[PDB]
Amino acid sequence: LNVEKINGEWFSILLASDKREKIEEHGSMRVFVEHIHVLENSLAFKFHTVIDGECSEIFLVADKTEKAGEYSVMYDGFNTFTILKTDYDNYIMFHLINEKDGKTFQLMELYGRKADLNSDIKEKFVKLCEEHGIIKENIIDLTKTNRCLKAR
């Protein structure tokens, strides 16, 4: 992966977890990406999220860890993530593990360079989720949600 090539603007399209509450409407992980800035040994993210019906911003910096390809960031506990698949100019898929109180759950995210992606790419993401034990019912199509696009 040439991580520089993931720099720039992105939109959150599909959001999936094995702990569904975390990505439901008031969940901590129901966040909508606006950009990823690639720095020397980190990735700087800007998100939106909805809190009590109002759009709000979250900025996070993830550091490279000792494992190649892996990044870590503190947000509602301790997260580690990797990039699973990308073509840089259309889609990117992330896999994240959150730890809190010694318990874990997975998040998978499909982002697009535009506000939607075609059915083929979405279906591929769905099968990758399932490969990770994230069942179809636990994958949310954020294009049918408030993604705070107007705050962008």
Residues that bind ligand CCCCCC(C)=O (CB under 6 A): 29, 31, 45, 60, 62, 73, 75, 79, 81, 94, 96, 109
Nearest to 5 by CA among 64, 83, 74: 83
Least distance in angstroms from the C-beta of 38 to ligand CCCCCC(C)=O: 13
Work out whether 55 is an interface residue with Cl ion (CB under 5 A): no
Q: How far is residue 109's CA from residue 120's CA, in Å, rounded to a whole number?
A: 16
Which residues, in sequence order, are CB contacts of 22 under 8 Å at separation 6+? Answer: 28, 29, 30, 98, 105, 107
Nearest to 125 by CA among 113, 107, 149: 107
Interface with Cl ion (CB under 5 A), residue from 44, 149, 151, 152: 149
Least distance in angstroms from the C-beta of 5 to ligand CCCCCC(C)=O: 16
Nearest CB to ligand CCCCCC(C)=O, comparing residues 4 and 119: 4
Question: Residues 1-40: x/- map of binding to Cl ion (CB under 5 A)?
Answer: --------------------------xx------------
Residue 41 and residue 33 in contact, taking contact as beta carbons nearer than 8 Å:
no
Residue 88 binding result from Cl ion, ligand CCCCCC(C)=O, none, given CB thresholds of 5 to 8 Å by partner type? none
Place of tokens 């409407």: 25
Helices (H), the chain: 119-131
Residue 149 binding result from Cl ion, ligand CCCCCC(C)=O, none, given CB thresholds of 5 to 8 Å by partner type? Cl ion
Question: Which residues of 101-144 form beta strands (DSSP E)?
Answer: 103-112, 139-141
Nearest CB to ligand CCCCCC(C)=O, comparing residues 10 and 119: 10
